[model samples]
Each structure stands twice: as structure tokens, then as C-alpha cells.
Target: VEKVFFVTSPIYYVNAAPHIGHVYSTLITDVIGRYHRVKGERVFALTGTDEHGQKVAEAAKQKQVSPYDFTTAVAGEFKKCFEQMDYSIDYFIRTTNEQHKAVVKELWTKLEQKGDIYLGRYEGWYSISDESFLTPQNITDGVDKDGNPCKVSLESGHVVTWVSEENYMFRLSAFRERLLEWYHANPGCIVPEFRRREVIRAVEKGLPDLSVSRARATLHNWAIPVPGNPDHCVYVWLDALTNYLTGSRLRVDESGKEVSLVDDFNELERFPADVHVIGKDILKFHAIYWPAFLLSAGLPLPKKIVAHGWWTGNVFDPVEKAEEFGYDALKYFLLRESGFSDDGDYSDKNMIARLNGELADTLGNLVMRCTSAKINVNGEWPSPAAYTEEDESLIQLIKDLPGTADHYYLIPDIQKAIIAVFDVLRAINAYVTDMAPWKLVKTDPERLRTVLYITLEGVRVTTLLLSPILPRKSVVIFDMLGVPEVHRKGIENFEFGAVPPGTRLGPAVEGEVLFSKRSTE
Candidate 1:
């Protein structure tokens, strides 16, 4: 089986606890990973905290502790979020870990050896809140809705600190033309389709000289020692990206085995990452700066960088209130309301509408009513499809199901897959409506059996497709359909043979609605 290396969310900074934004990325990745599992891929999914930064230093000071201590405490909070969401992440990397330090030093040495690093005096508008620097162009002149200077908090709204110290600069400008060409050749190199075009346009305009490493005054003494020089520490971006290598054991697997060779250094043939899912704000770091580092280090470049749109929400906005509503409602509201390209506003009304209408009313009702009615009538699952036009139409649809799903997965189009799930539900609902098994069963028992059998088969197919989204519920659905545990072989070679003849079906347990309606209350 082929293996896939999937990394995501850019290792969120540890200054604050995890929030809805964190959950959105993690849940999306979990769904994708589960889909691959069902499709039989060995997936190494890496996610974690970027624990080393100026922000960490400041947050630690606020808590009256060392950066390491602060990160250690905050790491638990992130882990808890993953647990609560049931994310099966392969590895959770903290950039503060000892192994990560070694990896950072190794990458720094590689770039330095290639003469990509140069000592330069740094001056840029730095935002203390976001630990990022801003150009004049990024700053806007206006008052925020709260009546504060409307500078982009991540980039602007900060003093330009002039640090006249030796800092390592990466040759980002050198790779600008090549990166642009690569993006053009691989159109889906970035995702949401439109985001890819925006990135390519940015690269075409050319990239700025990157400040690769930062050094404190010799007396400060708080950073990892530069591999060749004792006077400086590697910059936060370089240190953070190295977590991908260290966390994945890509540098070296267990038993102290190094994966890459030193002489004429080359990465041994391994699955170079398929996707690096990141937020839009950090496009420069992941899409531009990181690729430049890889080219200079003679490492394989990541295949695609899928940059997700930012979650746009206001705690105060009455029209789209995220805080006034519950999280579940807020989750779907953002997803449904937001297009794949634009930032989505969070609202209680949108959330409630999606949860109640889609989850509780449509999907939940379809599953509960149809299965419950079948179990009630026959007290068992009807036999596999017998010859009838409705039965054949449904069976034919089931036979074509996997191909429909594979299209979405192969493109790595997340929104397409999400749409496909609900689209399938819409079709099944139509089929059930047309067949009207409840009405048919009262008049003609044989016709009723045929209709119910086809409906159950459609439900089984849907359960497989929806497994990635809600695994526990999908399994319960399968069990209710009289399937003990269906394997890949069973699904792949699936005929009209999913449910056996007269299998004793279990009663549909009245589970709480998977999704609830969002409301203003």
C-alpha cells in the first residue's frame, strides 16, 4: 500500500488556548484521514504546537515562568481539544522537544552550507500579538469597528523595531521565478482553486528577502545555539517548519536510523508530503519561504499547499453572533455560509439553520424514520435486491457509488466531498419519497419488501460514504442494517449482497440528533 504524508494547521502558537478555528482544521483533517483509511492508505498525519517563539517568551513572562514551562502547560490544552474532537493524529509535535532542536539545527546547517544564509541588520514593523512583521502596504488607516486603529493585527499595529544584530537571511528572492513556474505547472498546488491563483500572483510579483534567523544580544542567552556559530539562534519560522521533519521521523526513524544522507545530501525516497494545510495569513512562510529552504537543502518540495480561508466572526455583531450561540451551531454555520474562497462570518442563526434543518431534520430524520419503519414492519432486514425497476435503479446507483466518491478524494477537494455526502442524502431522500415503502407495505407485502430492501441498501452505501465525517454514527448505522462489520473486500466487491436474506435487524436506538438547529436564543 502507498503511504501519504499529510501535515496541517501550521502548528498553532501556544500563547492562547485552542478555539473554534483550531477545531475546524483538526476536524476537517480527521475526516480526510478517515476517508483515506477506508480507501486503504497508510497515512502519516502530523499536527502540533509551534512552542518556540517571541510570543512564547512573552506569554511565559506573563505567567511568571520559563517558555518551556508555559508551553508544557498549554500543550495539554491543545491535546485535550484533539481528544474531545476524536482526531486520530499520528504525531503531535511540540517545537520545544529535544529532537526538534536537533532537526532545526540540521536544517540551519544545510541552508548555511549552501550559502543561503547571510548576516543582515533587520528592520520591520513587528506585531507583538501575532509575532509577525508588517510592510507599510499591509497597514491600513482607519478606526476598527471597536474604534481602534484599524491596522491588521497580525501584520500591522506595532512598532518597527530596528535590531542591528547579525541575522541569517534566506534567499527567498532567488526561488521566486521557479516557485511561480511550479505553481503554474501544478494548478492545484494550492486549494479552494482561487487561493492558488492568488498565491501564484503574489509569487509572480516577486518575494521579499526573508529574515531566516534572529539573534539576541550575546548576553540574552535564551535560544538554541546556531550549529556553526555560538552567537546566534535560528529564526522562529525555520525552527517551526523543522518540526515537520522531526515529528514525522522523516530525518530519522526509530532505532537511531537517519533517513537522509549527509554527503551530497538527498532525502531517501519517501512520501514527500501530499498537502500542507495552512491558514491564508501565513502564505509567505509556507508557500514561499519554506519551498525556498527545501530547494536549497536538496529536499523534495511539498506537492501542494492547501491554504484555508480565515474564519471571519465577531463576538459583538448581532447579525452574525458566534459567541451568543453554541459551538456546534457555529461550526456548520461557518462551513455552509462561507464559500471555499472567501472568509466566512460565524452566526447563531446560520448555525441553527444548518444543524436543525440538515442534521436533525433531513439526515437524522431520513435515517431514523426509514430504518425504524423497516424494523417495525418485518422485524428483520429484508433480503438483497430482487428484480424490479426501482430495485435495479438503486442497485445500479450503489454499484457506481465508489467511483463518485473517489473523484473527490483524488482531487483532495474537501468541499467537493462534503457536498457529495449531502448530495447523496438528497438523492436517497428523493428515492424514499418516490418509493413510499410505508404506503406500499400496507397494500402489497412483496412490493413493500422490495422497496424497503432497496432503501436499506441505499442507506448502507451512504453510511460508508459518511464514515469519514461521523465514524461512530456510521458504524451504528451499519449495525442497524444487520451488517456486523463490513471490510474493504466486502465494500469493493460489493454487489447487491450487502444485507443478507432475512437477517434479524436490531431496533433503531433513539439517539440524540447528531446536529441540532442553531437559534438566536
Candidate 2:
């Protein structure tokens, strides 16, 4: 049966330029999305900017431009950043888009109609930096960049201001028990078991009713106006969170005049995203507030939220590295070196080691040896013969399609999933070394074909597994081996002996390599 898979990277905010954190989230989502596509499921991956907020408004004012223009440029950069790196995003939804605004207003109306929203006066310290409200307990004395005394959020270090205003409130308190029940029933909904307990404890403690809107003047009219009240704009998180649904199903009126929210999203439109990819910093927002909003509106909840850890200390120009060592090499390093759910340091030192040691030394060394013109004349698969114990072991390893890699992907552990591929490559490399296929050419030409063919099988199988991670390079590798397009669709169709004896392989043209080593550079 054909299945539809929907996944999303949290819509990022437009206040700052697209950074490494932004790229990492998209990379994680794209890896899984492409993997599903490889498994023959129809996939739709969504990513975009969270454009409407006081932060973006003031940021634009400081630059002497309209917020719309500011968001437009940054959103373009995020989109292009992924585009150049070959991320497979199906849609990019800007919260300011007319359809997104329509969707936000509709969700507000749903909560309001269900009596989950009420008007209330809020008196508290609000931090625009976090789009959050804090009590005096978490607010502390601090100084701004200019050394002005300010009351900052002890949790976030952003200056907080005391404000009293009448605005819409969401009954987040009512969903506490239901949210807890949901979490209990679905134990694996949140990733990194470490991060989940904190969320569970916080919800169990009790949730306060959330302020779901801000006075229109305070926001400078830069947000989606609340459905019934023109004087308030929806809260930034609420408005930002709805972008998921907007990408899920965008209902619009004919003539481009109005976008409709009256009709329900169809089943095939792919609601309840299979995964919501985000950073650990936003776990509470995605794991807590997002679910409550959906529960209040009776919409399907996300199947999983994979929150990855942060990269710190240092960085380089991602675009330049993508240029210096092909995008696939850069992609390979990110997955191979990243801790995934824990903290990591990004530096040229680590990148160089990963690229040289694994990509170039292990994966690259094997491919160049097997496909060389010396023994692999015409670059064709040679006839197979009975295998010795070691040969059988290596052959059996590649024949086991997906192997532990399947479990890793299901855990949404791209880091381990990647390591699994290396596990096989390292074994195959050792096996080839022991057999000495290159030396077989001089002494036993007949045995040369047998050893090389088995080694080549190892290459073909692992390349298929790594296709999702190293897409661009894999295509070239598959072409180098002359594997037919029909045989390489995905791992689901994978089996042993897809390439028969005497099949002419593509040329391994001199001076070309799948992943180049630093020595060559």
C-alpha cells in the first residue's frame, strides 16, 4: 500500500540571519524525509520562517525597512541556503502569507468557539526576546549592551518589561490532564528521553492559562489580528505553531481574494505530521504549547517531535565548505560527527577529521580501489563463485538490507543510523585488505574477478543505504558501477545480485573521485 509521510522543520524566526542552527534543523528533517522517499513513501517536508512578531517588527525598524521586506530577504536566504545544499523541502510557509494568516485566524476562532479562549487582563513581565511571559521569580536584574539596568528573564537573559493589558487567553490549564494522558499513552512522542521528563514534570506541576494575544498597538500591527478583535494580534508562538497546519492543508477561495478556514483538511492532505524536527531549545514550545493548541482545536497531534542538540564554540562558512568539499562530503561530516541529541562542538578540526578519516579514508578508499581500471576492465561485474567463510561473512552483511540501520532510523537517530553505515564500510574495508584483491591481478587473474566482485557488492549495498545521507555522491557511485535505475529505487526493493555477471559498468574516469581527500586538495 502506498503511504503519505509528512514531516516539518520548525518554522524559524526571521529576527536574525539564517545561521548554522537553522541549517542543522533542515538537514535533520531532510535526511529523514529523503529516507522515507527512498523507502517508496510519498513524502512532503515543510520548512519556513516564523515571520510575524514584535522582534521582527523592531528589527526591521532599526534597519529602516518594512518588516515585510526584512522577512522577505531572510526567508529567501533560508530557502536558498537549503536549495543550494539540496534539501528536499516540499513547501515553505511564511506566517505572513495570506493563507497562513487565514489558517491562524481559523484556529483562533475554533478555540474561541469551544470556550477555550476568554478575555483577561495580564499583568506580568514579558520578554519579547523569547516571546514568553515570566513571573518575578524568573526575572532578574541585568544590563543591556549599553549597560542600562534592566529586568531580564533569568531563564533567557532577555530584558523583560512589566505590562498590564486586556487580551485573549487560551485555556492551556484545562488541557493539563489531557496532555499528561497523551504523553503517558504515547511514551515515544518526544525524543531524547532526557528532555521528555522535564516536560512531563512541568505539565504535572500544573499549567497556567496562556495569554494568546497582544494589543495591536504593542505589536505595531505586525501580527495576525485576532479573529473577532482587531485590537489584538495572535501570540507569536500560536501564530508560529499554526504554520505546520498551514503547510498541511491550505484552503483558499477562488479568485485569490480570500482564503477559507471553514472546510476541514482532507485525510490525504497529510495532517498529523509523522515528525516535527526542531532544536532542543524549543522543546517546551513544541512538546508542550503546540500539543495543547491542537488538543483545544481537536486536531490530530504530531506522531513525533525530534529535537536535536546544539552546535557551539565555533563554525565556518557552510556554503564555502559545501563548495570546497562537495555538499555530500559536508553532509556526511555533519551526520557522522554530530551527537544528535547531545551537545557538540563544530570546528574545522572535527570536520577535517571526519572527512579524512571516514568519508575519504574508509568510504572513498574502498570505492577507488574496486572501480579502478587496472583489474576492473570495462568496469563490469565479474562472475561469482563459491565463497569461503570470510567471503560469506562480507556477502551476508550487505545482503541484510537495512540491518540495524532500520532500527536507528525509526528511533530518528540519524547519528547512529549514519554510524551503522560506517560499521559496514569498516568491515568491508578490512575484508578487502585481508583478501588483497589488487595483488590478485598479478598472481591469480581468475581469483581477481571473484574477490573484486564480492567487494563491489559491498559497495553497491552500502551506497544504497547511505543514499539518503549522501545523495549527490551516491548517484555518481551508482553510475560508476553501472547499476540500472530500476534496481536502485530503494532499500525496500533491495536484494542480493541485482547486477548480474558481464554487465558493463560506467567508466571510472581518471582523476575523478566520489569524495576527494585533503592530500589531493
Candidate 3:
């Protein structure tokens, strides 16, 4: 049965240029989205800039530009970077768009009418960068870049300042028990058992009513104004989180008229999201605040929230090596080396090692050997004449791979899934070494052809299975093998002898190297 799958990357703040962290989060969502598409499911993957916040307003001031202008420029950079990285995003929603602002206002009014919103005086430590209110226990004294005294969030290290103002508040405190019940009802809603426990513990402790608007004068008139109060602007998190719904169902015309993108309100059933891909640092906002808001609005909660860890210390320095090695080599390293839910430390040496040891020396060398003119005479795929016990074992390994990899794909664990592909590569490498197609050519010509055919078949299966993870490179491999539009097929159709015996194969692309080894020096 066909299913509708909704996935989202956290709407990133536009105050800074897109970094590796931002790229990593979006890449994970994109990978998942592509996998669903490959399975023939209807999918919507949303990502964009979170533009309404004090941090953005302050960044614009520092750059001597209007806030809208600054956001436009930075959001453009985000789109460019994602495109360059080949992210398969359906919509890039900007929080400053007219449609998004309308949605935020509409949702706020809904909460207000439900009496979940109330006027209150907000008194606390506010972190502009995080767009979050911090309790006294959450703040610590620190020195700023200028070595001056500053209070910073203990969790994020962003500066926080005492703020006291009259603002609208959401009755987050009222939903603590409901949130707990939802957590109990939906096991595995939050991934990585440890992060799930952390969120459940926080919800069990208590929740305070959240301030949902800022005094207009204090925010420099850069956010969506509260529906009934011109003196207040909607809170940044409220404004930002609404982008998910807005992007899914709303659009604006050239006449500046806001309208529903879908045919009817019934189409809104695509939410709550199947998965929300996010960074660990903002777990509370997404897991706690976002769900509370949705409950108050009487909407369904998301099916899952996958909180991934960060990459520290020069993760992208290897991009400088991309000039020497292929770009997909860099893509392969990121997914294979980093655990999905654990913090990762990147090193240039580690990246080079993975590229050379795995990509170039192992998989790449296998392709070059199987496709070389020496064994593949007549440039046609050889039919297996006789099956040895060794040949049968190798074929069984190829047959078992797709089913094994599907398990990790359901976990949507990118790291383990890629490792599954590597497992096939390792087995194929060993099969080639054991069969010794090079040695067999001299001793037994017919047996060598069978070994060569078996090895080529293994490469074909591996290329098809790994396509989602290594798209560009796999396409090249497909072309090199002269496979006819294999991209149109799904994993279910994959099997032994799918390639007809005696099928004509083209010569390997001229000057084509799947991946080039890089120097550690």
C-alpha cells in the first residue's frame, strides 16, 4: 500500500551562515526522504530558515542592513549550500513569507480562543541566540569575547540576559501530564533510548507556562505581531515551528494573496510528521515546546523525533581534499564514520583513511578490476557455465543483502545502513580474492569467465542498493556497466541473474575512476 511520509529538518536560524551542523541535519532528512521515494511512497520533506528572532534582528543591526534584507541574503546562502550538497528538499520555507506569518497568526488565535493563552508578566533569563527562556539554574556567569561579565546558558553557552516584560503566555504547565501520557502511549517516539529518557524525565519534573510573545518595542519590530495586540510580537519559537505546517499547506500568489496550496483542509492530515530530524542541542524545544503547542491546538503529535549529534573540530577540512578525491567520497565518509545518535569527532586523517581504504582501494578497485578489458573480452557480460560450491555461496550473500539492509533502513539509521552496504563490498572483495579471476583466466578460461560474471553481478547489486547513500557515484557505476535505466526499479525487483546472460556490456567510461586515493600528507 502507498503511504504518505512527512519528514522535516529543524528550521535553522538565519543569524549565521550555514555550517556543517546545519548541513548534517538536512542531509539526514534528505537521505530519509530519498529512501521513502525509492520505496514508491508519497513524501514531503521540508527545510528552511527560522528568520523571526532577536538573534536575527541583532545580526542585521551588526551588518547595518534591514532585518528582511539580511534574512533574504542568508537564506539564499542556505539554499545554495543545500543544492550544492545535492539535498532533495521539496520546499524551502522562509519564516518572513506572508503565508507563513498568516499561519502563525492563525494558530496563535486558535490557542487564544481555547484559553490556552493568557496575558502575563514574564520574568527570567532569556537567551537570544537560543530563543529560549532559562531558569536561574540554567544560567551561569561567563566572559564574553571582550572579556566582560555575561550570563550564558549552561547548556548552549549562548549569552542570556534578565528580561521582565508583559507578554502573552501559553499554558505549557497545563499539558505536563498530557505530555507524559502521550509519551507513555507512544513508545520509541523519540529515538536513541537515552535521549528519550532525558525528555521523559524533564516532562515528569514539571513545565512552566511559556512566554509566547515579546514586547514589540524590545524586539525591534522584526517578528510576526500577535493577532490581537499590536504592542506584542509572537515568540520566535512559535513563529519558527509553524513553518512546518505553513510550508506543507499554504502558498502565496503574485498578487500577494495567501491561499491553501492543497485542494482542501482534509489534505492537512499529512501531519503530524512521520519524523522530525533535529540536532541534540534543541531537544527540549522540539520534544517539549513543539508538542505542547500542537496539543493545545488539538493536533496530532509527530510519530517520531530523531535527535542527532554534532560534528566537532574541522569536519569539513576534508572538503579541501575533495579537489583531490571525488565529492561522493566526502559524502560516504560522513555517513559511514559518524554514528547517528552519538557525538562525532572529525579528523583529516580519518576522512582520508576511509576514502582510500574503503572507497578507493576496496570498492573502487573492485569495479576497475571487474570492468577492465582483460577479462571482459567482447565487452559483453559472460554467462555462468558451471557453478562451483564457492560460486553458489557468493550468490547467496548477494541475495541476502537487500533484506538485511532493510532492517536498518526502518530504524532509518544511516550509519548502520551504509555499513550494511560495506558488508556486501567486503564479501565481494573476498569472493574476488578467493575466486582469483586473474589467475583463473590462465588456468581455466571457462571458469574464469564464470568468476568474472559472478563478480560483475555482485557489483551490479551493490551499486543498486547503495544508490540512495551514494547517488552520483552509483549512477556513474551504472553507466559504466551499461545497465539500462536501472534507476527506475526498486529493491524488491533485485535478484540473481536479473542481467540476462550474454548481455552486451559497454567499455568502462574513458578516464573514469570511481574514487581517487588522497595523500595523508
lDDT of 3 by residue, 1-521 (tens): 23468899999988888877787788788888887777667787888899887889999999999998899999999888877777677778889888788788888988998899999989999988788899999999998789999899998898898999999999999999988988888878888668889999998989999999999988899999998799999999999888777866754455424455653334655577888988888888889999998888887788888888762133453335455555677677777877855656467788788888988887899988888887676577787788888888888988887777777776667888788778888988998888778777778889878888888888888777777777788778877776777533575546766777677766555678888777889
Clashes of each: 3, 0, 0
lDDT of 2 by residue, 372-435 (tens): 8876865789987677888888888777647677778877898888888788899999998897
TM for candidate 1 is 0.85
How many backbone clashes are present in model 1?
3
Which lDDT tens digits does candidate 1 get at residues 1-521?
24454545578888888776666666566666667777666666767887766767777787888777778889998887776656666667778777678778877888888988887766764554555656666655555447765455434344333244556677887888888877888887777677777777878887777776667542134457777777777777778877666655544455423344232222322335677767677776777778788888887778777666764153433212434544433444444565556555454455566678766676777766556754347667665435677557666876677677767755665556556667767777777788777777677777767667766666677667767665666666666666666432234624545567577666555554445444557
Model 1 local distance difference test score = 0.65
The TM-scores, one per candidate, come to 0.85, 0.94, 0.93
The full ranking of all candidates by lDDT, starting with the best, is: 2, 3, 1
Candidate 3 off by > 4 Å:
250-260, 263-265, 311-324, 341-343, 486-488
Which candidate tops lDDT? 2
Q: Residue 151, candidate 1: how far off, in angstroms?
A: 7.5
